[PDB]
Design a protein around this ligand. Structure first.
Ligand code: 51G
Ligand code: APC
Ligand code: MN
Ligand code: MN
Length: 175
């Protein structure tokens, strides 16, 4: 989908110009770390510096969009027909971190690629951690296929053993 891919470029170019880091998350982050589009994506998940929220809102507005809805964890925005699902990360000693996520959730290095361009994305461990929360809200056997396949793909990329010990850590945290 050329519109989403073009929109991701436009957002990141604008953010780059003002030295605003943004991390692609969710489905697109998986595809970015793989360097391959694997399916249609329903939205664009973004992680932003929480104390610079206004700068991200201003880029959304510059691009002709607007903030649509506040959620418990962040906010949705709409640029044309495309949805941006935006969550804050907060400065933690020497890096931004998503609250309660595994350390390294928001690496300063651009470790994914989208349409040949390096992009910052959330770590595999942070991608997978959000599926653990999802699992407590819906059993994995009850997930839409696309989400099962995306999870399994992230898990194979990181390594199944690394996933199972991360899952044990999640269970310990939230026991
Ligand atoms: C707009 N739809 C979103 C969906 O994309 C999905 O959003 C996830 C959202 O579920 C996810 O939240 C998780 O992490 C939250 C918190 C620990 N992050 C610091 C607590 C809730 C937990 N589900 C966020 N980290 C990332 C966000 N893109 O789930 C909620 C939702 C409202 O259906
Ligand atoms: N109802 C829900 N409750 C909690 N977490 C959810 C959720 N639905 C999905 N998630 C988690 O939040 C992440 C982002 O969710 P979504 O944006 O809704 C789907 P996605 O994996 O990004 O595919 P997409 O590319 O088609 O949007 C998912 O990767 C999953 O980890
Ligand atoms: Mn998504
Ligand atoms: Mn989303």
């Amino acid at each position: 989908d050329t519109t989403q891919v073009t929109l991701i470029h436009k957002i990141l170019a604008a953010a780059d110009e003002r030295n605003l880091p943004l991390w692609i998350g969710g489905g697109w982050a998986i595809d970015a770390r793989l360097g391959r589009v694997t399916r249609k994506h329903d939205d664009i998940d973004l992680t932003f510096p929480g104390e610079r929220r206004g700068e991200l809102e201003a880029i959304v507005e510059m691009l002709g969009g607007r903030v649509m809805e506040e959620l418990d964890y962040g906010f949705l925005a709409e640029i044309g027909d495309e949805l941006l699902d935006c969550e804050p990360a907060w400065w933690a000693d020497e890096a931004y971190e998503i609250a309660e996520a595994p350390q390294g959730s928001c690496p300063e290095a651009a470790e994914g690629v989208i349409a040949g361009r390096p992009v910052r994305c959330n770590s595999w461990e942070a991608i997978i951690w959000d599926y653990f929360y999802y699992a407590d809200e819906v059993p994995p056997v009850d997930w839409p296929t696309k989400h099962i396949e995306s999870y399994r793909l992230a898990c194979t990329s990181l390594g199944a053993e690394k996933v199972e010990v991360l899952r044990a850590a999640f269970r310990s945290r939230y026991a």
